Amino acid sequence: SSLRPRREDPPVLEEWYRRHLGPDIHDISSSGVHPYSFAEIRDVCRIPAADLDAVVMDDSVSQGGEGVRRAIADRYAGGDADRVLVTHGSSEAIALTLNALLHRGDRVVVQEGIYHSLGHYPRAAGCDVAVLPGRAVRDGEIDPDVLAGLVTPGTAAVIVNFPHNPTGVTLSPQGLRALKERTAATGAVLVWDAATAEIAHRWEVLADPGADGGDTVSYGTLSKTFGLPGLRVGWAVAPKELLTATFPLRDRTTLFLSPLVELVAERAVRHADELIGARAAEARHNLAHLTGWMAAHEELVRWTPPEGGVCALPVFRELERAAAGPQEVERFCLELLERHRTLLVPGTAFGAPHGARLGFGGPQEDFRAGLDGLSRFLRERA
Amino acid sequence: SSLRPRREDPPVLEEWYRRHLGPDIHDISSSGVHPYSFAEIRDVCRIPAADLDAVVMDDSVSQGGEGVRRAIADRYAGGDADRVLVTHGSSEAIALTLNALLHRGDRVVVQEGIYHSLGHYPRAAGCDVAVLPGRAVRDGEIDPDVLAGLVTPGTAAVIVNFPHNPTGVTLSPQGLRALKERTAATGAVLVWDAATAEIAHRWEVLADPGADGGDTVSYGTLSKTFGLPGLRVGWAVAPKELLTATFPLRDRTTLFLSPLVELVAERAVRHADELIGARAAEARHNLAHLTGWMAAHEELVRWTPPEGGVCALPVFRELERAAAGPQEVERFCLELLERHRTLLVPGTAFGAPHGARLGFGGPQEDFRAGLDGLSRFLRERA
Numbered sequence: 174s175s176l177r178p179r180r181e182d183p184p185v186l187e188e189w190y191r192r193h194l195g196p197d198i199h200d201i202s203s204s205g206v207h208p209y210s211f212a213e214i215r216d217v218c219r220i221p222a223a224d225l226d227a228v229v230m231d232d233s234v235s236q237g238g239e240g241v242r243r244a245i246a247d248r249y250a251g252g253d254a255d256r257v258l259v260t261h262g263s264s265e266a267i268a269l270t271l272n273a274l275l276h277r278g279d280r281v282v283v284q285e286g287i288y289h290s291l292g293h294y295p296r297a298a299g300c301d302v303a304v305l306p307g308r309a310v311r312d313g314e315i316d317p318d319v320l321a322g323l324v325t326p327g328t329a330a331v332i333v334n335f336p337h338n339p340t341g342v343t344l345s346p347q348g349l350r351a352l353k354e355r356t357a358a359t360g361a362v363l364v365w366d367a368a369t370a371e372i373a374h375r376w377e378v379l380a381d382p383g384a385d386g387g388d389t390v391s392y393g394t395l396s397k398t399f400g401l402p403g404l405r406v407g408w409a410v411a412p413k414e415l416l417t418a419t420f421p422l423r424d425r426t427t428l429f430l431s432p433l434v435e436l437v438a439e440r441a442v443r444h445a446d447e448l449i450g451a452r453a454a455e456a457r458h459n460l461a462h463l464t465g466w467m468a469a470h471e472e473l474v475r476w477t478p479p480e481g482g483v484c485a486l487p488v489f490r491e492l493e494r495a496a497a498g499p500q501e502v503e504r505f506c507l508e509l510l511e512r513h514r515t516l517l518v519p520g521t522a523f524g525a526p527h528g529a530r531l532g533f534g535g536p537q538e539d540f541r542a543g544l545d546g547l548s549r550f551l552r553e554r555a
Numbered sequence: 556s557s558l559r560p561r562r563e564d565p566p567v568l569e570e571w572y573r574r575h576l577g578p579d580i581h582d583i584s585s586s587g588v589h590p591y592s593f594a595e596i597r598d599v600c601r602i603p604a605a606d607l608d609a610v611v612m613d614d615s616v617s618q619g620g621e622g623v624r625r626a627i628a629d630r631y632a633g634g635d636a637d638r639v640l641v642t643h644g645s646s647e648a649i650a651l652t653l654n655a656l657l658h659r660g661d662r663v664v665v666q667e668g669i670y671h672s673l674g675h676y677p678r679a680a681g682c683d684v685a686v687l688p689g690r691a692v693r694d695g696e697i698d699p700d701v702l703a704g705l706v707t708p709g710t711a712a713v714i715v716n717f718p719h720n721p722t723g724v725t726l727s728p729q730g731l732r733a734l735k736e737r738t739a740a741t742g743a744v745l746v747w748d749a750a751t752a753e754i755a756h757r758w759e760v761l762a763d764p765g766a767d768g769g770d771t772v773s774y775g776t777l778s779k780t781f782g783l784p785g786l787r788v789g790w791a792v793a794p795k796e797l798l799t800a801t802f803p804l805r806d807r808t809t810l811f812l813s814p815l816v817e818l819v820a821e822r823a824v825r826h827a828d829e830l831i832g833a834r835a836a837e838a839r840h841n842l843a844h845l846t847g848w849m850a851a852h853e854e855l856v857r858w859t860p861p862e863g864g865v866c867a868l869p870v871f872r873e874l875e876r877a878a879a880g881p882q883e884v885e886r887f888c889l890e891l892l893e894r895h896r897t898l899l900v901p902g903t904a905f906g907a908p909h910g911a912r913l914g915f916g917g918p919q920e921d922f923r924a925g926l927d928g929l930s931r932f933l934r935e936r937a
């Protein structure tokens with residue numbers, strides 16, 4: 174037969190979860206907040222059974238249901254619905270837009286250690302790619318000298334995710350303001366992933382660049398801060414001109430969304446503050462206990478604390494002392510899972526060989542035991 | 556700025572609906588049955604509010620929720636769940652699988668007049684494409700001489716949709732049995748879209764080739780026969796070996812489905828017969844009235860009656876008499892819409908210049924007026 178499936182490697186992050194995610198374990202690896210039950214959702218976002226039952230299971234539209242597009246636009250695009258594309262999670266948004274945006278040849282600046290599919294599509298589009306290093310961003314700004322060197326006239330796009338999954342680095346309202354001007358001046362397009370935007374620790378929550386009305390693309394999703402990764406709804410905020418040029422590709426992949434799923438999402442974006450607040454507040458209870466845990470263990474673990482989001486990237490000192498290979502952290506994260514029922518994401522997924530993703534977005538009531546698992550783990554090896 | 560959106564033409568079918576679909580009109584253009592309300596769905600498929608509310612809005616899995624994969628597998632894959640991939644409508648299934656299946660160079664046989672994205676992906680994959688003509692399939696079999704010529708050793712895949720959207724041509728259990736053997740013998744992969752599979756008029760409902768356990772790919776969806784185009788759930792039935800090789804692409808596009816949407820779909824596939832039966836029976840009430848309407852108008856309209864599905868392709872004699880250009884049918888379908896509030900899909904979407912898609916899957920209670928609209932329309936021009 175001619176059944177030869179094309180061999181492409183799975184991205185480290187997804188394959189890790191596929192292989193190891195399951196029940197009977199203390200999971201502290203997620204870059205998002207722990208999910209709500211659908212019960213809770215109807216209660217918080219105010220959804221009667223009669224409103225769901227009234228939904229005709231018919232075709233939605235290409236750009237997204239008018240109701241839910243209004244809800245996102247108001248919050249993120251300054252009322253302009255024509256500038257929102259609603260997608261099957263922000264993943265579909267990234268795929269559709271970047272496909273329509275990037276050409277072969279163009280110079281594109283991509284944040285180091287970025288979530289794959291954001292660096293994946295420019296790499297695929299055969300773009301000329303120049304890395305914006307991790308160390309270049311500190312104290313809520315990108316070294317203006319590094320910005321001058323990397324983003325010059327001609328440059329097609331600058332792709333960044335802030336707050337950063339997994340490190341938890343982000344920008345000050347000034348830092349973003351500088352970056353906007355740099356890209357406005359060179360003609361570059363700011364591509365801006367705002368997945369964990371709503372949870373900020375050091376500075377105030379960053380206003381969406383897509384709200385300006387300029388030549389920028391920004392993404393958002395109900396999956397990280399909202400506690401609805403399983404609703405599968407995200408968006409892109411960008412010029413109508415681009416969004417409509419994504420339709421042909423949508424026509425051979427997904428077509429459109431469920432008006433039922435849209436109904437729900439519309440109410441989630443309206444009652445967003447109630448949804449995020451309860452989870453953010455909970456996550457900081459966790460952050461506090463983590464910081465103490467960190468200082469108690471500073472002989473074995475070094476870290477930069479998150480300036481945003483609900484996950485960090487602790488670095489284990491023993492992997493720096495041996496120094497490579499990257500395969501070690503995976504063995505580490507495996508042994509941690511087998512002996513103590515505790516999950517992290519090995520840093521090989523984020524170009525941080527010595528690091529690992531520790532997420533504190535989950536339930537307070539352990540949480541704690543994952544740490545107590547890792548604590549027991551770290552002592553045994555030393 | 557560098558915001559130059561890549562210019563790709565929208566497929567005729569989708570852009571037609573985008574431009575012209577709306578309210579205040581009699582729509583008789585759909586290749587599927589008219590949709591259910593979510594109320595009706597909970598009533599028919601037996602879904603209490605307490606079962607929905609119990610759903611944690613968390614991550615589903617890559618291949619699809621075990622519950623809903625069982626429901627499809629039992630009905631379509633002979634119990635084997637490992638052979639089902641559940642996707643955002645069959646559209647995602649076609650995209651994921653064909654991407655993983657087709658290589659550059661291979662010879663692929665593609666049914667004439669096929670729904671775009673089925674012919675789109677082999678064309679994209681740079682495959683060597685040879686058309687299987689419309690006239691080659693009649694009386695529930697493909698001319699065995701045409702099969703001998705087109706599907707020879709080496710041939711990578713044969714892509715077909717039966718019953719055919721829009722013509723409504725399909726196969727006898729013998730016709731499919733012949734086609735299976737031809738492809739089994741040459742080593743070719745049968746790619747088989749079974750969207751409108753459950754509604755058959757001339758022969759019995761075609762058993763799913765994916766149930767054999769051989770090297771075949773078959774698609775299915777709750778969108779055409781089930782009355783749930785707005786639930787956005789379809790599947791592929793194929794070897795686990797292929798389906799798992801689609802994961803990398805899913806990881807940069809959609810990730811997975813909603814466990815809430817899966818819960819619903821699981822109950823829809825179990826109560827499938829109740830869902831289809833009420834719509835099939837209704838559609839045949841419509842077919843009967845259409846056949847009479849057809850014979851009453853045989854001076855202006857010629858057609859082959861559907862052997863399956865809920866749409867046909869009537870041919871208007873005036874477009875054959877003038878003979879081209881293809882742009883005429885669109886003017887026709889536009890003028891029909893403007894003067895009489897009646898929608899069809901102009902045949903330019905299916906490589907049938909003189910034809911137009913008339914769907915009889917909609918509500919009985921006009922229905923009739925669309926015909927009475929088209930009747931009034933046809934007389935005026937002659």
Ligand SMILES: Cc1ncc(COP(=O)(O)O)c(C=O)c1O
Pocket residue numbers: 204261262263264265288334338366368393394395396402405406407809810
């Ligand atoms: C920054 C970022 N963007 C996007 C995604 C994909 O999520 P979704 O498609 O639910 O928005 C993830 C999940 O790992 C993420 O961390």
Ligand SMILES: Cc1ncc(COP(=O)(O)O)c(C=O)c1O
Pocket residue numbers: 427428586643644645646647670716720748750775776777778784787788789
């Ligand atoms: C044969 C066929 N397959 C697939 C589709 C896409 O539908 P879905 O993605 O809902 O399965 C259509 C809709 O026009 C169709 O006619």
Ligand SMILES: [Au+]
Pocket residue numbers: 184289290291293806807
């Ligand atoms: Au990727």
Ligand SMILES: [Au+]
Pocket residue numbers: 424425566671672673675
């Ligand atoms: Au297409």
